[PDB]
Amino acid sequence: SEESQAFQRQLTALIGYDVTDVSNVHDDELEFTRRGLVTPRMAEVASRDPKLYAMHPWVTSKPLPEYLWKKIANNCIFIVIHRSTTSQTIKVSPDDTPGAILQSFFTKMAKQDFVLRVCGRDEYLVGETPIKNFQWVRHCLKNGEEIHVVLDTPPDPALDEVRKEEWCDRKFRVKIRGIDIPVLPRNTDLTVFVEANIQHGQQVLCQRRTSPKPFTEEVLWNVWLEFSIKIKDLPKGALLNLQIYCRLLYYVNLLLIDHRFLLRRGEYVLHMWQISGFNADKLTSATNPDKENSMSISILLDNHPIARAEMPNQLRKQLEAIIATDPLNPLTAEDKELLWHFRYESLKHPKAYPKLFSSVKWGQQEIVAKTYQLLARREVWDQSALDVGLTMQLLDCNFSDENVRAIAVQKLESLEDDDVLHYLLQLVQAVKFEPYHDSALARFLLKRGLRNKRIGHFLFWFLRSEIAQSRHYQQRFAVILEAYLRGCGTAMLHDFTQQVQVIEMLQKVTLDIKSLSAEKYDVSSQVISQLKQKLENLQNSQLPESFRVPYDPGLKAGALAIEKCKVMASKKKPLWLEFKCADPTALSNETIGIIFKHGDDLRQDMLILQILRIMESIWETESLDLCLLPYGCISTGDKIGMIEIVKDATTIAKIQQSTVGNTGAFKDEVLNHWLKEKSPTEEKFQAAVERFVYSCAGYCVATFVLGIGDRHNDNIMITETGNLFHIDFGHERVPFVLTPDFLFVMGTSGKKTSPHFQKFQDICVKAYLALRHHTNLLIILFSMMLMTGMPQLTSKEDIEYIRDALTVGKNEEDAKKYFLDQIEVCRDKGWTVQFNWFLHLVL
Numbered sequence: 001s002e003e004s005q006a007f008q009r010q011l012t013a014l015i016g017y018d019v020t021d022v023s024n025v026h027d028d029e030l031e032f033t034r035r036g037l038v039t040p041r042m043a044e045v046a047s048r049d050p051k052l053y054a055m056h057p058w059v060t061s062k063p064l065p066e067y068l069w070k071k072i073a074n075n076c077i078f079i080v081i082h083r084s085t086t087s088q089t090i091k092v093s094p095d096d097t098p099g100a101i102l103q104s105f106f107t108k109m110a111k112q113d114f115v116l117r118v119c120g121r122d123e124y125l126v127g128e129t130p131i132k133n134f135q136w137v138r139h140c141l142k143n144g145e146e147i148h149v150v151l152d153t154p155p156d157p158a159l160d161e162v163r164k165e166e167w168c169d170r171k172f173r174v175k176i177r178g179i180d181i182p183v184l185p186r187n188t189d190l191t192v193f194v195e196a197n198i199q200h201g202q203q204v205l206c207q208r209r210t211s212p213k214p215f216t217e218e219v220l221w222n223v224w225l226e227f228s229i230k231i232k233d234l235p236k237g238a239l240l241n242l243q244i245y246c247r248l249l250y251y252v253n254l255l256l257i258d259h260r261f262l263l264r265r266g267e268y269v270l271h272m273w274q275i276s277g278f279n280a281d282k283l284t285s286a287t288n289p290d291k292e293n294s295m296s297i298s299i300l301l302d303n304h305p306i307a308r309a310e311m312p313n314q315l316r317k318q319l320e321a322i323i324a325t326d327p328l329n330p331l332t333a334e335d336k337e338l339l340w341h342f343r344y345e346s347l348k349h350p351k352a353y354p355k356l357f358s359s360v361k362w363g364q365q366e367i368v369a370k371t372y373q374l375l376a377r378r379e380v381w382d383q384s385a386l387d388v389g390l391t392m393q394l395l396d397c398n399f400s401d402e403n404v405r406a407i408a409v410q411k412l413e414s415l416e417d418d419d420v421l422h423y424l425l426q427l428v429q430a431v432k433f434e435p436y437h438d439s440a441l442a443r444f445l446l447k448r449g450l451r452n453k454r455i456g457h458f459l460f461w462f463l464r465s466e467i468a469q470s471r472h473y474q475q476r477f478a479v480i481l482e483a484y485l486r487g488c489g490t491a492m493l494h495d496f497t498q499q500v501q502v503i504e505m506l507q508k509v510t511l512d513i514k515s516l517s518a519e520k521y522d523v524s525s526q527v528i529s530q531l532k533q534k535l536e537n538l539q540n541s542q543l544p545e546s547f548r549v550p551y552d553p554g555l556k557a558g559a560l561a562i563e564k565c566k567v568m569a570s571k572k573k574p575l576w577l578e579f580k581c582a583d584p585t586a587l588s589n590e591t592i593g594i595i596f597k598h599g600d601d602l603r604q605d606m607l608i609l610q611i612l613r614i615m616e617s618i619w620e621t622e623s624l625d626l627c628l629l630p631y632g633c634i635s636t637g638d639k640i641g642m643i644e645i646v647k648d649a650t651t652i653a654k655i656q657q658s659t660v661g662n663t664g665a666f667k668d669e670v671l672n673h674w675l676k677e678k679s680p681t682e683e684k685f686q687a688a689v690e691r692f693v694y695s696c697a698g699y700c701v702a703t704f705v706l707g708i709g710d711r712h713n714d715n716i717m718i719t720e721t722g723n724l725f726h727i728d729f730g731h732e733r734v735p736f737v738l739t740p741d742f743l744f745v746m747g748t749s750g751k752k753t754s755p756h757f758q759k760f761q762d763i764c765v766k767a768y769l770a771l772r773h774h775t776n777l778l779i780i781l782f783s784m785m786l787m788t789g790m791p792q793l794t795s796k797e798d799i800e801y802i803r804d805a806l807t808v809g810k811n812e813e814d815a816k817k818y819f820l821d822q823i824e825v826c827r828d829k830g831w832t833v834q835f836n837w838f839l840h841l842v843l
């Protein structure tokens with residue numbers, strides 16, 4: 001069951017999709033997979049330390065960087081502790097444990113077992129890790145801040161309670177019968193054919209077509225299409241891709257071998273996805289839910305079972321050549337035959353693996369078996385250091401083999417939760433490339449989220465973002481989400497509920513406001529009136545008392561600071577919202593700022609931001625900090641989501657719009673003044689000059705690499721404290737934004753050098769060749785990003801921007817001399833493209 005059906009209505013509304021719905025399935029893969037996941041769920045729900053789960057201590061094994069060791073000169077660290085408006089400070093050793101610190105303290109208050117929380121956050125200092133290795137702590141030191149902690153009692157784990165569960169030698173051939181569309185697009189008598197491809201990692205094995213016929217709402221062929229491939233030569237996760245041309249209009253897929261290892265038989269009526277204008281949506285096994293409008297196709301299958309010596313110098317060297325090669329450098333057939341013939345040697349190089357597995361005739365069963373026997377003797381892989389780049393490459397769209405893919409996931413098992421989070425978004429996107437719903441990766445995500453509430457929390461928002469936005473992959477993800485929610489345990493189930501209500505109310509209000517101010521760049525007085533009046537109407541009796549901040553889940557937002565809420569001056573109309581802090585133990589009257597925006601696809605932003613955090617950990621590996629500000633951003637629904645407001649920041653634009661703000665005129669000395677008036681000490685000023693030379697530099701390198709470098713002044717921001725950063729990534733050229741305003745902070749004005757600019761060029765180039773040491777990682781992440789994240793994109797040229805950007809094939813010399821001249825454009829062009837945004841207002 002009676003109540004067991006509410007739970008299911010509870011799940012469905014937290015998901016935003018009904019997994020019990022079967023109107024859009026031509027088999028039971030989804031149901032079977034809802035079934036399959038219970039165990040890995042129940043297994044992980046069975047095996048998690050209830051208290052450690054409840055406190056989700058956030059923590060790393062990485063060393064502390066050179067830079068933050070320079071921040072400590074006593075081998076000793078200060079921590080302020082409070083109980084109830086009593087508070088004292090303790091000199092602690094960087095290697096001290098939490099429990100070990102309770103010893104130095106049960107020494108104090110009085111002259112049972114309690115826990116240390118961060119003041120203001122649902123964030124705890126527990127577990128047998130040294131304080132140096134909690135992430136909050138490294139965070140405090142970086143920004144120059146005290147460590148404040150309250151002694152309370154731990155969260156009862158009975159709040160994590162989980163509801164009790166209740167579970168041939170023939171050639172291949174396919175009868176195409178015809179297609180039907182109800183209403184016809186273009187109407188002038190055109191010409192139309194079907195194309196049917198047998199696929200495996202975009203590797204096309206065989207292809208057949210039809211005779212073309214007149215494109216009328218119904219087109220009937222009734223033809224057998226006999227392929228070259230043999231039934232016994234079909235591989236698992238091979239797709240029957242079916243496409244319609246006149247050129248490409250619609251596409252649809254059918255897994256030829258089903259999730260039971262069963263060849264696929266019978267009649268199918270497939271509703272087809274329509275093209276807009278390669279792309280992960282193209283790969284999907286899902287069918288178009290919109291049956292009323294969509295093109296569809298009828299087919300039939302009547303087709304049961306199935307489940308050394310020493311190499312010469314000059315070839316080794318071709319092989320090593322091949323292997324050295326970047327991910328996107330394609331293999332000649334010469335290349336591939338080499339790789340294969342010498343597969344056992346190729347096996348001793350883990351860098352080879354992607355290249356080697358894309359040198360497999362997956363359309364011969366004989367070869368696949370040899371390939372599986374290859375995968376048997378996996379000593380060398382099994383024992384290699386985890387290379388995420390490498391590992392990820394084996395998860396992309398090029399690899400549709402269950403067992404190749406599965407070796408990559410074996411490697412991920414060894415990631416700590418710290419890193420799981422780094423790549424979590426990209427791993428979640430990688431599911432799009434899994435041929436089946438139920439996959440080792442899916443399972444790995446499921447597992448790891450249930451294991452740790454932080455990962456679980458982000459996993460939720462990531463899956464939900466996609467479910468709500470993408471029809472191609474919402475069924476699959478919805479099944480993985482349900483699986484998660486079923487184990488995350490009631491505490492979280494309530495948190496998610498709080499959150500989902502709030503963000504649904506606030507998007508109502510976001511969109512209603514765009515209706516009102518049409519475009520008219522001004523926000524009428526009446527617009528804020530109503531904005532104000534609604535938020536009063538919303539808190540009244542409806543909104544949650546409080547709630548976790550999806551982008552920063554340690555933070556429980558309280559009530560709204562309605563006085564300070566507003567709408568922004570955009571052509572879009574984003575909401576500027578500020579909330580009180582629900583935690584009354586917190587340190588500040590500083591509100592929680594959140595912007596709500598409809599108008600740009602924010603998945604794209606999420607992806608860039610993540611890559612930014614990765615670049616930042618890469619610089620952590622050379623003891624480098626470049627002070628990037630990858631503020632929080634969460635896609636929640638359709639071209640809509642939320643954003644962290646970064647306190648005490650303005651637009652480079654508005655800094656020009658201060659003294660001038662004209663019809664578009666710029667001045668050089670003005671940034672540097674803005675900083676002086678916001679630096680109560682002259683040190684603090686040069687420290688802002690400081691943070692800026694870094695932030696500026698880092699943002700110069702990263703932006704060039706991704707190719708999002710020619711940006712307006714308006715979409716770059718700086719803090720009152722010197723931290724510059726780009727924003728709004730949903731939105732003569734120039735490689736990046738290094739304006740003349742910037743360089744004058746570096747003691748220079750177009751065509752000279754200085755103490756702080758030599759330093760700028762120093763970091764830049766170091767930063768640049770540091771990323772180049774992780775070239776293949778960035779290539780793979782960017783490539784994947786594009787495929788899962790974007791519009792359409794050319795599966796050569798778009799993808800291939802970044803390898804000329806990272807100046808592949810070159811030496812730290814040539815490469816620096818590449819990047820250095822990229823600077824000496826922004827010195828030639830100065831204002832000239834900055835200048836340009838506006839002029840095109842009419843061009």
Ligand SMILES: COc1cncc(N2CCc3nc(NC(C)=O)sc3C2)n1
Binds near residue numbers: 574595597631648728
């Ligand atoms: C126009 O909508 C978009 C889209 N993407 C990002 C973005 N910014 C994100 C970070 C950010 N911090 C601010 N702090 C202050 C004090 O104004 S304002 C802002 C807006 N704004």
